[PDB]
Design a protein around this motif. Structure first.
Motif, short mmCIF file in Angstrom:
data_model
loop_
_atom_site.label_atom_id
_atom_site.label_comp_id
_atom_site.label_asym_id
_atom_site.label_seq_id
_atom_site.Cartn_x
_atom_site.Cartn_y
_atom_site.Cartn_z
N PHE A 246 50.46 46.89 0.43
CA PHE A 246 49.90 45.46 -0.33
C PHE A 246 50.87 45.20 -2.25
CE2 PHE A 246 47.87 49.88 -0.03
CZ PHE A 246 47.02 49.71 0.66
N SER A 247 50.62 43.43 -2.14
CA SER A 247 51.23 43.32 -3.23
C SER A 247 50.23 43.64 -4.94
CB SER A 247 51.70 41.62 -2.66
OG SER A 247 50.82 41.39 -2.41
N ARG A 248 49.31 44.30 -4.58
CA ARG A 248 48.85 44.69 -5.77
C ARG A 248 47.95 45.85 -6.06
NH1 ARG A 248 44.21 43.14 -9.28
NH2 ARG A 248 44.66 40.34 -8.48
N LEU A 249 48.64 46.62 -7.17
CA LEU A 249 47.89 47.94 -6.86
C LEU A 249 47.39 48.24 -7.79
CD1 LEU A 249 51.51 49.80 -7.08
CD2 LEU A 249 50.15 50.00 -5.06
N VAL A 250 47.00 47.45 -9.04
CA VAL A 250 45.94 47.05 -9.53
C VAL A 250 44.61 45.98 -10.28
CG1 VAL A 250 46.98 48.39 -11.53
CG2 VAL A 250 47.57 46.09 -11.75
N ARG A 251 43.93 46.42 -10.99
CA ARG A 251 42.84 45.44 -10.87
C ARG A 251 41.84 45.67 -12.32
NH1 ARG A 251 37.66 43.27 -10.17
NH2 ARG A 251 38.07 41.48 -8.25
N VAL B 222 54.75 59.74 -13.39
CA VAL B 222 55.48 59.42 -14.66
C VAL B 222 55.48 57.98 -14.73
CG1 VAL B 222 57.62 59.60 -14.77
CG2 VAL B 222 56.69 60.88 -13.36
N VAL B 223 55.30 56.91 -13.99
CA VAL B 223 55.31 55.60 -14.93
C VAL B 223 53.93 55.52 -15.05
CG1 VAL B 223 55.71 53.50 -13.78
CG2 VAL B 223 57.25 55.32 -13.19
N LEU B 224 53.23 55.76 -14.55
CA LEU B 224 51.87 55.91 -15.04
C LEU B 224 51.38 56.11 -16.86
CD1 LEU B 224 48.81 55.41 -15.66
CD2 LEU B 224 48.35 57.49 -14.25
N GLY B 225 52.01 57.42 -16.93
CA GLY B 225 52.00 58.03 -18.50
C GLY B 225 52.77 57.44 -19.25
N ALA B 226 53.71 57.35 -18.85
CA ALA B 226 55.76 56.45 -19.79
C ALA B 226 54.70 55.13 -20.10
CB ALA B 226 56.32 55.81 -19.07
N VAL B 227 54.02 54.51 -19.29
CA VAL B 227 53.36 53.37 -20.19
C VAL B 227 52.95 53.53 -21.09
CG1 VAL B 227 54.59 51.86 -17.68
CG2 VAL B 227 51.82 52.30 -18.03
N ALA C 74 48.85 47.83 -19.83
CA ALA C 74 50.07 48.77 -19.18
C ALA C 74 49.91 49.13 -17.95
CB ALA C 74 49.39 50.07 -19.61
N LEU C 75 48.04 48.73 -16.80
CA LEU C 75 48.57 48.80 -15.83
C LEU C 75 49.18 47.74 -14.72
CD1 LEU C 75 44.75 49.67 -14.83
CD2 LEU C 75 46.52 50.70 -15.34
N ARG C 76 49.51 46.63 -15.86
CA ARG C 76 50.30 45.25 -14.69
C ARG C 76 51.99 45.91 -15.21
NH1 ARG C 76 46.92 40.46 -15.50
NH2 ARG C 76 46.35 41.34 -18.19
N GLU C 77 51.92 46.81 -15.69
CA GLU C 77 53.28 46.93 -15.97
C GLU C 77 53.73 48.14 -15.29
OE1 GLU C 77 56.30 45.97 -17.08
OE2 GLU C 77 57.57 47.31 -17.38
#
Ligand SMILES: Cc1cc2nc3c(=O)[nH]c(=O)nc-3n(C[C@H](O)[C@H](O)[C@H](O)COP(=O)(O)OP(=O)(O)OC[C@H]3O[C@@H](n4cnc5c(N)ncnc54)[C@H](O)[C@@H]3O)c2cc1C
Length: 392
Positions: free
Chosen positions: A280-285, A314-319, A329-332
């Motif tokens: 997918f080219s999207r992971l968040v909304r 890890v990335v989730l927590g980091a942002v 945060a979700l965009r990053e």
């Protein structure tokens, strides 16, 4: 109102759906970043193995879960590829140089032990079981999910870690991606180590005819094994036809393979038709993010599904470490993960096509390279995949 401080305990609630590798990794990372998570899991009750490569291990370490890897990671030190007929070494080498370049040891673990330990770490009291999400809705103030049992829950952030058949995924994407059959069937399970097969500290794979038979050590003197066979989907085959199926699919294969077919237990052995999903080219909304298999569903051919989910967390927590702007945060998060998991899905797919005789000549060329392989090229290739993870 607008002057509420979102760092205070209780002002930021994340709803995490799924208590598998991704869900629990995610909840742990968010909690590290000072966010309260309620974890929801569909099954009322839990239920062969994965190899957690150094990228996944470092992620586990980063999340405060390194002791689980250390304790339960099987002793993987070397790997070999073997001719299917003679059962002889086409190539053999140690993974030490990989531990040195990547900073961690690879850690094969039983899926059941890994599941339990992660639950133990998070705490079962903080997971609500029998909660199968059907739907999420978001508005200005937050997000809400509904469960099949008629209950619902509301929060500021929604983590969809609900697996390869994610129910939330379509809401995030706006459509329903479909699983693509990868063209092969995997039989997997555990057996006690027995050097009449392979070295207990080695990942040994017999290759040929677009098939493979693999063994690698997990904890407590045991082998994670699996057989791959390219086949049309839908063959009338289960646990009762199992040993006969394997016996014919691997007729002529070296004695160790035959001893494996005899040794295993069909009732504990799994038969899975392998699928993946176009990236997918999207992971968040809005306030909702796909994590784990929900956000990227790969063939297991480079052993990065579980690792990728840990990376995601890890990335989730980091942002979220130093912001409370959920949308940013979700965009990053998406920014950092999307090309990674796309490459992992596609790399897995190509490895799969080469391994299983999509083009039998390319597969034979690959066997040819395995006979002429020192270990340098494979280790390089592995380091590339690993060092491309978020903790480098
Ligand atoms: C044969 C095979 C070999 C593999 N080998 C490796 C390997 O060597 N290394 C590696 O890193 N990865 C490997 N993988 C991939 C790895 O198993 C997965 O990528 C990993 O389990 C995905 O984690 P997850 O939490 O996202 O998904 P899941 O483990 O599937 O967790 C999803 C959770 O959500 C729950 N759930 C589902 N629907 C709902 C709902 N509607 N509401 C609430 N809860 C729901 C499910 O019950 C489950 O508990 C392998 C996979 C296979 C099939």
């Amino acid at each position: 109102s607008s002057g509420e401080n979102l760092y205070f305990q209780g002002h930021m609630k994340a709803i995490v759906i799924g208590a598998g590798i991704g869900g629990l990794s995610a909840a742990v990372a968010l909690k590290q970043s000072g966010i309260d998570c309620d974890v929801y899991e569909a099954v009322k009750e839990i239920k062969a193995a994965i190899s957690v490569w150094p990228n996944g291990v470092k992620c586990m370490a980063h999340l405060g879960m390194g002791d689980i890897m250390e304790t339960f990671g099987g002793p993987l030190r070397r790997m070999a590829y073997r001719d299917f007929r003679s059962g002889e070494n086409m190539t053999q080498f140690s993974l030490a140089p990989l531990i040195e370049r990547t900073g961690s040891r690879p850690c094969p673990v039983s899926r059941a032990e890994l599941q339990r330990e992660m639950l133990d770490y998070w705490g079962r009291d903080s997971v609500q079981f029998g909660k199968r999400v059907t739907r999420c809705e978001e508005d200005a103030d937050g997000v809400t999910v509904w469960f099949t049992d008629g209950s619902s829950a509301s929060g500021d952030l929604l983590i969809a870690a609900d697996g390869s058949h994610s129910a939330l995924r379509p809401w995030v994407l706006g459509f329903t991606p479909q699983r693509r059959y990868a063209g092969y069937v995997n039989w997997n399970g555990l057996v006690e180590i027995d050097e009449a097969l392979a070295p207990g500290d080695q990942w040994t794979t017999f290759v040929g005819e677009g098939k493979r038979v693999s063994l690698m050590p997990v904890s407590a003197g045991r082998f994670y094994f699996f057989f791959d066979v390219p086949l049309p989907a839908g063959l009338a085959e289960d646990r009762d036809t199992l040993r006969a199926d394997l016996s014919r699919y691997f007729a002529g294969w070296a004695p160790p393979v035959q001893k494996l077919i005899a040794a295993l237990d069909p009732q504990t052995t799994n038969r899975i038709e392998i699928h993946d999903i176009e990236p997918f080219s999207r992971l968040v909304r809005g306030r909702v993010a796909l994590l784990g298999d929900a956000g990227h569903s790969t063939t297991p051919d480079i052993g990065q599904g579980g690792c990728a989910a840990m990376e995601d967390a890890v990335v989730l927590g980091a942002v979220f470490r130093q912001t409370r702007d959920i949308a940013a945060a979700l965009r990053e998060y998406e920014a950092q993960r999307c090309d990674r998991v796309r490459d992992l899905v596609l790399k897995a797919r190509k490895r799969c096509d080469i391994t299983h005789g999509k083009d039998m000549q390319l597969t034979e060329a690959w066997y040819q390279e395995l006979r002429e392989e020192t270990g340098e090229r494979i280790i390089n290739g592995m380091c590339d995949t690993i060092l491309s993870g978020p903790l480098g």
